[PDB]
Assembly symmetry: C5
Homo-oligomer: 346 residues x 5
């Protein structure tokens, strides 16, 4: 009746329970059903290609040696300090770079035991998980982060992991990300590792994150468009003001180069072309073409009177031709980069 003697009667030397033996030795494999609650989600860094998460991991399995029939209550929520005295699955995260438990006050490790021997085991973890990021279409990209739960020491004939049938991944209410939107749907997949040591169980969960475009509109696109429009001002300046137009061209080209360099400041040094790179390259080509247009005008207007009329015609043609070509480029760029974004994330 007392609780103290029941605790060590269930598991102990008198009971003969061995925590080094899985519940069904030399029998069917242990079936562990897992679910995850995401308390926080952030620190998504493209430079290191990883993200930090904080979760409650819940594992449920069955231990026949832990079945009791004395206490009337079906479930026993006991003290989370006898985890060392019972068998537990050897779960680990395959793509984890860094993981830690939480020891604030009492370690966060809930354990409930049912009448039939069902064990529920909940533990709070902080993980840093690697995420290979495809940075093509970078300002308008969608990334897929994965989380793999794998057995390290037991093969498929001893330990099998399964996702819970209902709500395997829950997210804390009000969880928002400053840079990304987390899609409501989450993919559950069956990884299965094959090493030279054998076959090991694995379960995978995939989160989809869409980058928000407002910051890049404020920071990169609008300043570059302003530089292009500023370079167009040269066409309305008197053709005899050589220092003015030449300085306009120089400053616009150099500023465009600086902005192109700065657009990849917080990104890994990937060796393919991104969407922002295409935008910056076209803007640089536009400002360079404006400077070359003035160079042609200056060269033509001193060939001595059709040489003056020809330069005036070049300026008047450019005044309308540059914005029209830029508008056509903008239409094509935005249409094709909002059409690629209609490709299925899967």
């Amino acid at each position: 009746m007392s609780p103290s003697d029941f605790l060590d009667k269930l598991m102990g030397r008198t009971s003969g329970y061995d925590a080094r033996i899985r519940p069904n030795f030399k029998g069917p494999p242990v079936n562990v059903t897992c679910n995850i609650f995401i308390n926080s989600f952030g620190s998504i860094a493209e430079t290191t290609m990883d993200y930090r998460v904080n979760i409650f991991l819940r594992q449920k399995w069955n231990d026949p040696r832990l079945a009791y029939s004395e206490y009337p209550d079906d479930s026993l929520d006991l003290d989370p300090s006898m985890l060392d005295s019972i068998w537990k699955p050897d779960l680990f995260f395959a793509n984890e770079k860094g993981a830690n438990f939480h020891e604030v006050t009492t370690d966060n490790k809930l354990l409930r035991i049912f009448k039939n021997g069902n064990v529920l085991y909940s533990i709070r973890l902080t993980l840093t998980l690697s995420c290979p990021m495809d940075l093509k279409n970078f300002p308008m990209d969608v990334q897929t982060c994965i989380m793999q739960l794998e057995s390290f020491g037991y093969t498929m004939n001893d330990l099998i992991f399964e996702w819970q049938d209902e709500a395997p991944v829950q997210v804390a209410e009000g969880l928002t990300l400053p840079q990304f939107l987390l899609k409501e749907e989450k993919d559950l997949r069956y990884c299965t590792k094959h090493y030279n040591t054998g076959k090991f169980t694995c379960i995978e969960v995939r989160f989809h994150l869409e980058r928000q475009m407002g910051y890049y509109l404020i920071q990169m696109y609008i300043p570059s468009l302003l530089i292009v429009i500023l370079s167009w001002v040269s066409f309305w300046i008197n053709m005899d003001a050589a220092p003015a137009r030449v300085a306009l061209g120089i400053t616009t080209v150099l500023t465009m180069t600086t902005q192109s360099s700065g657009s990849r400041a917080s990104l890994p040094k990937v060796s393919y072309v991104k969407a922002i790179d295409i935008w910056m390259a076209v803007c640089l080509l536009f400002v360079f073409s404006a400077l070359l247009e003035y160079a042609a005008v200056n060269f033509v207007s001193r060939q001595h009177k059709v040489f003056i009329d020809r330069a005036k015609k070049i300026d008047t043609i450019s005044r309308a031709c540059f914005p029209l070509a830029f508008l056509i480029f903008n239409i094509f760029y935005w249409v094709i980069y909002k059409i690629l974004r209609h490709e299925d994330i899967h």
Copy 2:
């Protein structure tokens, strides 16, 4: 009479005390009253959306098995090394990203036991707590940091947390923050977590922090206003000095772009518009309009004499119209951003 035998007579194998059993087993839930002393408060980072605090956490509860009637003194302040031999609540901080205890010399873990079994337990902690920050109205914003104290392994029928009736949150005297002002009032709320594992107790405390505006006046607003005034100098320069006025416009526009980029250097990449963004955008529009005004003057004054008088009229009109419009914008901006700040923090 001796202290040594009393210490292990109160809790030990002879006494039969079990630290794995809560004080009132199969009875009413344990009522733990908590209070907090804030020793330090700082490291408020908008990029990571967290703040670091150092606290003394005091928990008081009642243990009937710990009631004694031998020693005359009502309270016993004993050695803080037998915390492992008594039951303690499993408190944890829900929004904590990182927590640590202090082990300098002797671990800081005071324990007092009263005659009636009242236990007072004080522990020094350093916490990093996540704070979701609303950066709209950024230079003139007010943030609300929260701290949640929650039970991990016990449900509401076993463990209930309550704030102390008098002085639940105390702050160290002379505690100041370089960037923020901490409001005297603190909000105490009742969170209550509902997971698939059950219902768990929670208590919340909210601190209000008002950002001080002096640094942003020195660093961002005044330099931008100086750039705008500098761009106004062009209107008083001779209209024939094309390189001078064109260079003025170019340099002011490029400097304005650089300042706008630098105004978000230490901020998260949020995708909404802040107050400083509106200010920078309007200043950029003003300097761009000054350059376009000179472009119009230069184009008009060479159409050949009303063409010269018209350009002179444009310059004389701009000389008065630009500062007046800027003053009207300043009045509206500051009035509406000191009117929004009158909205109740709650």
Copy 3:
């Protein structure tokens, strides 16, 4: 006679010594005298408002139960591994953000026991201590760092800390700081904490640090003075060279703005005005006034001959008036900021 049996005869089950009981139970409080040797001193960061120190902490007290009369030698320097078997004071550092012990080879924890029971206990620590910094007069400021030694679990009726009468704070010979000068005198004060848990002993030591001005002369003051002198060159250029003088004014103003922004790069975002801020503001006002002077000259000289003579008079007056006013400002600035520095540090 053997040492091995004497070691556990002094403290052990046979002796009846209890390490959980203070030396004079139910009697006068234990008087612990402390002294500190500073091995290193550095990492003074204004952004985080803390400094890192490395110390040897020596505590001396009396334990009557540890008095022996067998060995002829008065002092016994024993192995530093039986610290767990004797009572020790629960000292801690109130303003410490981070502390660590040193475990290189054998842990650094000397223990000597005298014939009369006097215990000397020396331990090597590394501390990060918070220092609230008053950054007014920043380039020519004097800071006061404090170190508080406080009892966590014992009140004044059980434990009292005192500084040693002679040499309570010693500094390692040749200890220098790259940015600061450490004053020879150190202040010893009596803090005493009053919480809702009671009254706790505290002792405080204050170090005074004077910032050295050579780096700021090389880095900030001289470049700004050079920019001001460069802006004065405009007064000697021909008044018809509008692009030259206008470009001089623009570049000087923009460079002054950049230097003013950079002068607060490694400082916390405080919301008051510092001395370097006043210097930068006055230099910016000077260069802006030079540009406005040229704007006035350019406007006046085209009003058509007294209009040319008047502009020449303005230039000739400015040539002498600008350096004289700057010299007067320099005299006042340096005099009042070397007069404020004569205020007593206490």
Copy 4:
């Protein structure tokens, strides 16, 4: 038959097994065969000259005292908590700056014991390994990272390490690096340490990494080439526009200096010349020569008419001579830096 008594019958006080004695005491040395699975590979930093890896390390050896003949199954995959009760080799990584084990849930330490006493021991590690990098030919370099497995406490007469005959190094499928390509072939070598303490076994594995050139084309080469082409525009401007051409030369030279400084931002301060340094130096020489060409033209054209024709001839010659010389330099540079890259990596 029971597992519990078999576990401590194999190794324990009853068996007489001593974990402090190697399997063949006073006999032939223990032959440990090792293999490695690389789970992740990244964080290759030139500044610190190290790279971070995550591996599964598998060691196989023979322990005659662990041979059993009771259980029918040839292999026993037991609980990974009795590693302390058996002898294990003292492997360590010679070039490791930082190493850590993984304790997520159950520590990742698989152990299998065969009928004949063969022990297979697999452990998950995260290593930071130093890599001395030869940065000559930096944008087009190939680096060789090494990993050394060495015995610390046993000499060659007690412990010998060998690579597994088949698949000693496996890489996870889909493992990619943002900056480098990892060559399929891996070199296996026999290091052998000779200290004053004796001779110690060592085995080495070498990975070859080729840097991808796309990022440096986008970031460094193309902007510099654009600056050079921009400097060529001066030759087509009217020779009387002195401020325009002089400003072109100044801006191109200063931008070239800034790009040369920025090309070594994320590199160690090595004291030899790299390929990117040669490219930047030649580009700087080209833009400086363009400015000096205009200086010569300006000086010649005012010697007063053959002085005007001579300056025109200089400009017309430069118009064709500068791009031709730059093209010849580009041909030579790229040919010799894609010829050096044909040198055998070994």
Copy 5:
């Protein structure tokens, strides 16, 4: 004969060996001879004034109680897990800011015991050691790093440290440093600490590091020399081109200021003058003098014809006088900073 009983017969309760007593109690002090193997050497940071090293530390002493006469072999290389059961010296590093042991696989702690009781104890450590750096002559300086090995708990009458007579400091073959050259000779000195707690043994080793000058030639000296040569181009431009020459002077002065600021980017904020500071100051003075020369020419040439001839004479004199004075300064600077470097390092 068996090894297992011999291991605990040598040290154990049966033997009576006490690890808390030094080998010769109440006798002559223990003489520990030390030597060091440097596996790696790097991370020399001037900002924090420290360097990181990785070493094997070998200590040899004599323990009479450990002398055996049973096993025929003179030396026993036993398992490195019984270090807790024998006495060891309490060595520590006086100038260490951070130290860590290596626990990869089996902890790296070799122990050999000889027939006569000689103990050899080797341990792998990673240290961060503070190094006070004299940054006068910074680009061409030589630094001296020290390493102190000191006893913490034992005085000179109990424990004495000595360097090994032959090869006390060995360096791994092929050890190179990107920024420094490590001199072959190493100084061995006798520190001896005198505290208020007594006299403590210490041994010191000094390494000499010479900074390599190639990086600073590429990064700082050559760009500044190019800026000076660029400023000399103004003397060959027509004296009537005021915007061109004035812009040349402005850009050269501002770029020189920026380079002077950037030359101390990765250095502590010391308050004395370095060699690079002298170089930058003289270059800044040269470019400022060129601008002032043009200002004088512009002022003189409009005093209205001897006023034109005088300005032409000033320009022609400057054309030869500026490079000659710069060459003389270069000769003096390099001669005296390669003469100071001939001072003996000791």
